[PDB]
């Protein structure tokens, strides 16, 4: 029986937008917001099974920017009051014989200056010898980063939304 392990990588950035508005727009309204403002990034998001809570299975189809590829996510948890959203990658290019699943956690933390700290944890569920490239991981972190800036810009330009 092959070695089962977990490789954990955590990363953070800041936003001028405080957690309640950021969690409502960027996290809870991702399916509707991102295809609408960034069609090149996301073509659409479709719920396959569930209502939007824990256990929900959803397929995200990318735009031209990611060669109309796609990812399938399972929602592992949602804590609206603490701004925590957990989900697993259950179908995607990042999975292999070596990486069977990636569980992510996005947590919004408030700061005293009125902003947010966006804390992203990636947990890679490994099988056998572990061979994880820093370039492969950091391209995934850059990806999430440049997209967030499009969301942040839009929310600043449309202050009446997600209040
Ligand atoms: Cl990238």
Curated annotation (Swiss-Prot):
Coiled coil stretches, renumbered: none
Family: Belongs to the BetVI family.
Gene: FRAA2
Function according to Swiss-Prot or TrEMBL: Involved in the control of flavonoid biosynthesis in fruits, probably by binding directly to natural flavonoids. Binds the natural flavonoid myricetin with affinities in the low micromolar range.
GO CC, any one term: nucleus
Top-level taxon: Eukaryota
GO MF: abscisic acid binding; protein phosphatase inhibitor activity; signaling receptor activity
Xref: InterPro entries: Bet_v_I/MLP (IPR000916), Bet_v_I_allergen (IPR024949), Plant_def-hormone_signal (IPR050279), START-like_dom_sf (IPR023393)
Lineage: Eukaryota, Viridiplantae, Streptophyta, Embryophyta, Tracheophyta
Cross-referenced PANTHER family: OS08G0374000 PROTEIN-RELATED, STRESS-INDUCED PROTEIN SAM22
Protein keywords: Allergen, Flavonoid biosynthesis, Pathogenesis-related protein, Plant defense
Pfam family, one: Bet_v_1
UniProt name for this protein: Major strawberry allergen Fra a 1-2
GO biological process: abscisic acid-activated signaling pathway; defense response; flavonoid biosynthetic process
Protein species of origin: Fragaria ananassa
